[PDB]
Design a protein around this nucleic acid. Structure first.
Lengths: 112, 43, 47, 119
RNA sequence: GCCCGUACCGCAAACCGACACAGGUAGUCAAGAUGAGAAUUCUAAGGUGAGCGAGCGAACUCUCGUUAAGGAACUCGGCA
RNA sequence: AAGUGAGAAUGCCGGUGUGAGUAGCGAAAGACGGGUGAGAAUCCCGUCCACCGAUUGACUAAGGUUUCCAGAGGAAGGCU
RNA sequence: UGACCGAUAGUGAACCAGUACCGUGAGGGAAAGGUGAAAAGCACCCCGGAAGGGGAGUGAAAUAGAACCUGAAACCGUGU
RNA sequence: UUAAGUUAUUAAGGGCGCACGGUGGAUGCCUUGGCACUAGAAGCCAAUGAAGGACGUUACUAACGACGAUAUGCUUUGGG
């Protein structure tokens, strides 16, 4: 049995939230939150909230253990981006993109 | 630097307006074109 | 001053081999059920 | 020695911190600033131990001539409290010995927060 | 004892410059010390702390200060 | 019976790349204490310090056309 | 009525069209259709300040949840 | 055990094949909107104030249409 939890649309570049997802992959939940409460990244408290919500999904729906839990998969898909504009010199103007992410995390127990 | 187009209310209603375009026959043809097209603003 | 050719998905993924962050010290608190920073203190981590 | 801004600006800031750490006991700032105000505050406590006129005049060349204590409900002007309370409470070989406690980083930037209390 | 304007910005984050743009925009009033002065350096009032920060003190570029002995030998030219 | 077959016209329109986590983030000097909150270098009060100083002061006119006051915010918005 | 078009086609306009916007002025001139048969548009419980999830429920279908028929490439990821 | 000689293990990352995701709106199907004609009405409006407008009128809403201080309408025929 396994539990999952998706955020769906987050104001943060997907390439910047993929640098903190390669540190809590294939580890214990207890050590996972500890590593997320030490990194000084901008996407550290966001991932923690999702990871903390996924651990509560297998405590009321499946009512399983918490100490004997391991994060199985953890990725982040791209989402819709907003188009902006920035005035440059000589009248010409450039373009700005505001991409979003779809952070997802599934928790298992080391067995299918 | 000083650019062009200096705002002026009185001057705007002098060179243009509805009383200046309805004074000549040449300017009365520009009021019919806009009316035909369907412009929501006439002078 | 301008790229003559475009980079591929193999030469672009080869340059991002060292671009990563290191793990923290994580000085486990003696007895408080929390986590204190290396040579630091916290409101939860007693030690 | 370390830096941060301009010669004059740096000097002014240093004086402000020292005076603010003499009428507030413990304060919290950055790391570099806390490792530079621990040498201009200990020297001021060494002048308060002597308790002579010359030292008093030399101690008024750094300490701000204002910041009237409001917690004492009187007209204490820093110096008096430093040449009466702080001075009459230390008898160690480190004169105005002070300790620093490191903490977690700030949210705005990445500066490491620290706390410098009197001891 | 009729009719119209009266808010708010207005030497500017609200006007003209595509932007919260180191630019442009007619008039009136304007205190002390030093001085002939609306010049020059401080200041009373009034208005603000200006719209990313924290460490470090490499090369190189830009503004600024000083320099032994010589004094245009520099250079198209005492250019700066 | 035909608007019948697409790889090239510095072809027209839309979507997504590479350069790259690179260039840049455009006027004054800030420092700490208390408060508010899920969250504060950036908001509110207080003390000290500094800048403009014939002006980044005060008032008429042109021009713009609710940006003015109070209470509540989900983002978008504001080069963090 | 049609060996006419079927949303880059057909009128510039199937919807917020001579409208957003652009110019002192004459003038120039876009983008944008589709949940289901019927809103029966997710009652309730759990994590979070909220956004959004995981169960449950409505339905023939919830990978039909208003980024709402079908969902192709470029491009971005995880396991092997 | 020595001395000589022949071959390994590692994967920081990359390559190919397969399985499952996300962004994007091509393709298929559909139609409130158009295009070309045919038969027949028709081919004007206005000092009895026109075409087109400005400001208004709902019980509640901004457009859009209708309406005019008798203002989302009146009196008179019917059909229904």
């Amino acid at each position: 049995m396994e539990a999952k939890a998706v955020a769906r649309t987050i104001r943060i570049a997907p390439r910047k939230v993929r640098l903190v997802l390669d540190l809590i992959r294939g580890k214990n939940a207890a050590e996972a939150i500890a590593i997320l409460k030490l990194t000084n990244k901008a996407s550290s408290p966001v991932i923690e909230k999702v990871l903390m919500s996924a651990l509560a999904n297998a405590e009321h729906n499946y009512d399983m253990n918490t100490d004997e839990l391991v994060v199985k998969e953890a990725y982040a898909n791209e989402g819709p981006t907003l188009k902006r504009f920035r005035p440059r010199a000589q009248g010409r103007a450039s373009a700005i993109n505001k991409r979003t992410s779809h952070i997802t995390i599934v928790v298992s127990d080391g067995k299918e | 630097v000083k650019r062009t187009y200096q705002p002026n209310k009185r001057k705007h209603s002098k060179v243009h307006g509805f009383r200046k375009r309805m004074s000549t026959k040449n300017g009365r043809k520009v009021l019919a074109r806009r009316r035909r097209k369907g412009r929501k603003v006439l002078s | 001053a301008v790229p003559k050719r475009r980079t591929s998905k193999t030469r672009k993924n080869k340059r991002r081999t060292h671009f990563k962050i290191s793990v923290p010290g994580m000085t486990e608190c003696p007895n408080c059920g929390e986590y204190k920073l290396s040579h630091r203190v916290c409101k939860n981590c007693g030690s | 020695r370390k830096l941060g801004r301009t010669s004059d600006q740096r000097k002014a800031m240093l004086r402000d911190l020292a005076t603010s750490l003499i009428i507030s006991e413990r304060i919290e700032t950055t790391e570099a600033r806390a490792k530079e105000v621990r040498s201009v505050v200990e020297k001021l406590i060494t002048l308060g131990k002597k308790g002579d006129l010359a030292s008093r005049r030399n101690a008024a060349k750094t300490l701000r001539n204002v910041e009237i204590l409001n917690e004492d409900e009187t007209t204490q002007t820093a110096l008096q409290k430093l040449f009466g309370e702080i001075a009459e409470r230390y008898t160690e070989r480190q004169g105005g010995y002070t300790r620093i406690l490191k903490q977690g980083p700030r949210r705005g930037d990445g500066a490491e927060s620290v706390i410098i209390e009197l001891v």
